[PDB]
Amino acid sequence: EKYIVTWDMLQIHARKLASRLMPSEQWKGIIAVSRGGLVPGALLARELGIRHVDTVCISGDGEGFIVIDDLVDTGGTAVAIREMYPKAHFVTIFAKPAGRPLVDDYVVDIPQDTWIEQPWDMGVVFVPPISGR
Amino acid sequence: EKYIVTWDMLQIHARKLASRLMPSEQWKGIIAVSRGGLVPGALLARELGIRHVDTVCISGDGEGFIVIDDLVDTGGTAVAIREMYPKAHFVTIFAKPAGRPLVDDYVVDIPQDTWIEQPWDMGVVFVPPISGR
Amino acid sequence: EKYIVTWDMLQIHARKLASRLMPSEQWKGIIAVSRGGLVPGALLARELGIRHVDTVCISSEGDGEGFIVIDDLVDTGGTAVAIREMYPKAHFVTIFAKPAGRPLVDDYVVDIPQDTWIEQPWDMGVVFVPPISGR
Amino acid sequence: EKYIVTWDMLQIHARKLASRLMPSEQWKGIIAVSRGGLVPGALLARELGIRHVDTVCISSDGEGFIVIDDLVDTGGTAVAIREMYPKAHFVTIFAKPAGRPLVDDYVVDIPQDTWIEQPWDMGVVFVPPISGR
Ligand SMILES: Nc1nc2c(ncn2[C@H]2CN(C(=O)CP(=O)(O)O)C[C@H]2O)c(=O)[nH]1
Ligand SMILES: Nc1nc2c(ncn2[C@H]2CN(C(=O)CP(=O)(O)O)C[C@H]2O)c(=O)[nH]1
Ligand SMILES: Nc1nc2c(ncn2[C@H]2CN(C(=O)CP(=O)(O)O)C[C@H]2O)c(=O)[nH]1
Ligand SMILES: Nc1nc2c(ncn2[C@H]2CN(C(=O)CP(=O)(O)O)C[C@H]2O)c(=O)[nH]1
């Protein structure tokens, strides 16, 4: 019940999201939710050729701005974004069921009780064999 | 649709398969189908603590042997394996729907029409941004 | 030839940079230079437990005191000098450095020879590569 | 002396080794030393276009063949191999100082007091952040 997101896979998902976001010229900018959306944001910015990357922290119109986070679950962040950026295009990479109807787009379905680990919280490390033989 | 198998992901599936082949001592060795089964074979051998790794090329009876290939589709390979090693336990990492019942064990379901690419056939290389913006 | 930086390696270098910047609490925040500094910035923020990540874009207040400013690579020092003018008191770091730019950064991790071309993992992907022999 | 070798990096080395074993048709087969040489051997097989991959196990004439292991250190393994296959071309990916001239080819020089960790003994796992802040 643990979902491992490797860097390569994250990048594959982000490129899929970026192609759906084409043409790039419809967008003025990218706003990354600190800090889960920072990496997915950098990835969109690279693929869409958008240099205007901003961050917003959560403890303005927004039309033509992509607002990105890594995951939607409850949708609390999605709600909070709408306060200052009600016309923004809110997207995430991953979505759990309750958050699915609260985003403008997402790439991968994740079940509610699955724990997803993001690659910035992981590393390549020695792992003992499954069998002591 | 193009399915990309990264090394990290391949290894994750191999470990999932290995814990299903637990306990290890029930096995005497492993036979890898050249060349698709070579790497998954190596990984199984590591995770099970088995040094006896053999190979077979497809143009002894197999008792207590694991026979591994990367992907089952038609089951042509499975047939030959069953003829050479009727007493052997045949597994793959990936299975397309036709092959699904022709293996004793597998890990990942692949659609019939999806093209899967294995990491030994790929490499990390510059890829032009999706947008020229 | 080309120096390939994979995601795994970049992260190893960022963690090394993070350990040197310890203890975290001596820092108010992180300013990532868009776009090269964004991922290295995000990695630093995770490792130092800093939630306050800003960005700066250079084209073509504060003095930055207590802030880390991060970019991917220093070479000429064009970005560096703009960063000095804009943030005279920030600690300016990169992951990679070519010899021309070394004296202009407060800290970096990997020395890259001047004429080496380095490819960052956000510009790369896992793709089919034809075998070396046709046989 | 904490040297992490990832899958991508291993594959880069194996491709470099394959290139210097060119032209391919001068070889008739590859013999992988189990278990260290299996993945490298599999990679050589793909790159040189050799379907004929065998294995050999050593515990405690080979003409026109490549025998491959992951690393030479003492050369003890090389000795057994020269005895078994006096005309084989013996190659490794990595070589520590005592072993370097004891193989016909290698790619990476490794210091004696460096411990390298191969990617089949590792995995992507959660790593606590450097600061608890
Ligand atoms: N790494 C990881 N994080 C998770 C997981 N599930 C929930 N989250 C996060 C969701 N979250 C948010 O602020 C987003 P939202 O709930 O839509 O406002 C805080 C975290 O709990 C999970 O399986 N793995
Ligand atoms: N790389 C890759 N290979 C594939 C794919 N689908 C089928 N194969 C192979 C399956 N195969 C076999 O000999 C095994 P079997 O069909 O069970 O006897 C030959 C190939 O066509 C695919 O999506 N990608
Ligand atoms: N990916 C990669 N980028 C490079 C390389 N060498 C130079 N750069 C960049 C450095 N750069 C900057 O604005 C930073 P600075 O030169 O200190 O002002 C522009 C690019 O030319 C290289 O080998 N690889
Ligand atoms: N993964 C890894 N393995 C190592 C290392 N150094 C030595 N080895 C192995 C080399 N070895 C051999 O039998 C080869 P040889 O000594 O030439 O006959 C057994 C292990 O000690 C190391 O840094 N990393």
XYZ file of C-alpha atoms in Angstrom, chain B:
133
model
C 0.410 4.050 -25.985
C 4.114 3.631 -25.113
C 4.856 2.045 -21.693
C 8.262 3.036 -20.281
C 9.950 0.606 -17.891
C 12.708 2.311 -15.934
C 15.375 0.343 -14.115
C 14.016 1.470 -10.721
C 10.520 0.294 -11.625
C 11.703 -3.028 -13.086
C 13.559 -3.689 -9.842
C 10.491 -2.834 -7.766
C 8.440 -5.416 -9.691
C 11.234 -7.986 -9.346
C 11.214 -7.589 -5.590
C 7.402 -7.896 -5.482
C 7.754 -11.143 -7.468
C 10.596 -12.386 -5.221
C 8.638 -12.061 -1.973
C 5.926 -14.189 -3.651
C 8.525 -16.876 -4.326
C 9.342 -16.918 -0.609
C 10.598 -18.954 1.093
C 13.707 -19.259 -1.070
C 14.963 -22.678 0.064
C 12.143 -24.400 -1.836
C 14.124 -23.356 -4.954
C 17.282 -25.042 -6.204
C 18.179 -22.500 -8.856
C 16.924 -20.157 -11.530
C 16.999 -20.295 -15.314
C 16.799 -17.040 -17.226
C 15.418 -16.954 -20.755
C 17.991 -15.133 -22.892
C 17.907 -12.246 -23.085
C 14.627 -10.865 -21.735
C 14.875 -12.886 -18.511
C 18.558 -12.155 -17.790
C 18.178 -9.004 -15.695
C 14.941 -10.013 -13.935
C 16.738 -13.305 -13.367
C 19.728 -11.567 -11.815
C 17.449 -9.548 -9.530
C 15.526 -12.628 -8.373
C 18.831 -14.392 -7.729
C 19.964 -11.483 -5.575
C 16.736 -11.168 -3.616
C 16.358 -14.920 -3.066
C 20.009 -15.539 -2.203
C 20.441 -17.923 -5.127
C 23.838 -18.208 -6.836
C 22.801 -20.954 -9.251
C 21.795 -18.814 -12.227
C 21.492 -20.539 -15.597
C 20.327 -19.432 -19.018
C 18.471 -20.932 -21.970
C 18.191 -19.665 -25.527
C 14.991 -20.529 -27.423
C 15.189 -20.727 -31.242
C 17.105 -31.781 -16.790
C 13.372 -31.511 -16.076
C 13.246 -28.304 -14.047
C 12.237 -29.501 -10.581
C 12.817 -26.843 -7.936
C 13.785 -24.434 -10.697
C 12.373 -20.990 -11.371
C 12.286 -20.097 -15.049
C 11.975 -16.383 -15.763
C 11.360 -14.229 -18.853
C 10.553 -10.503 -19.007
C 7.143 -10.583 -20.702
C 4.547 -13.191 -21.693
C 2.306 -12.351 -24.657
C 1.335 -15.231 -26.940
C 2.915 -17.891 -24.736
C 5.077 -19.357 -27.493
C 8.091 -19.116 -25.172
C 6.024 -20.581 -22.306
C 5.233 -23.635 -24.461
C 8.882 -24.371 -25.235
C 9.737 -23.794 -21.557
C 6.996 -26.218 -20.506
C 8.422 -28.824 -22.913
C 12.018 -28.488 -21.690
C 11.094 -27.855 -18.045
C 7.666 -29.387 -17.260
C 8.427 -29.598 -13.523
C 9.633 -25.958 -13.452
C 7.879 -22.871 -12.132
C 7.595 -20.322 -14.966
C 7.253 -16.620 -14.150
C 7.526 -13.277 -15.910
C 7.441 -9.644 -14.853
C 4.917 -8.496 -17.419
C 1.924 -10.296 -18.954
C -0.354 -9.305 -21.804
C -3.935 -10.641 -21.501
C -3.389 -13.729 -23.676
C -0.310 -14.822 -21.722
C -1.901 -14.188 -18.310
C -2.918 -17.820 -17.634
C 0.125 -19.366 -19.371
C 2.443 -18.388 -16.508
C 2.601 -19.630 -12.927
C 3.247 -16.080 -11.706
C 3.571 -12.526 -12.984
C 3.526 -9.007 -11.580
C 2.243 -6.353 -13.948
C -0.687 -6.381 -16.380
C -0.047 -4.832 -19.785
C -2.795 -4.112 -22.390
C -2.452 -6.107 -25.623
C -1.895 -3.008 -27.761
C 0.494 -1.151 -25.438
C 4.125 -1.151 -26.577
C 6.410 -1.755 -23.594
C 10.080 -0.663 -23.706
C 12.597 -2.272 -21.357
C 15.350 -0.201 -19.705
C 18.200 -2.161 -21.287
C 16.958 -0.762 -24.630
C 16.834 2.829 -23.390
C 19.063 5.518 -21.952
C 18.928 8.933 -20.335
C 19.353 11.496 -23.142
C 18.576 15.153 -24.032
C 14.919 15.542 -25.102
C 13.760 18.785 -26.721
C 11.258 20.808 -24.653
C 7.640 20.025 -25.687
C 7.261 23.722 -26.580
C 9.728 25.902 -28.468
C 8.528 28.943 -26.497
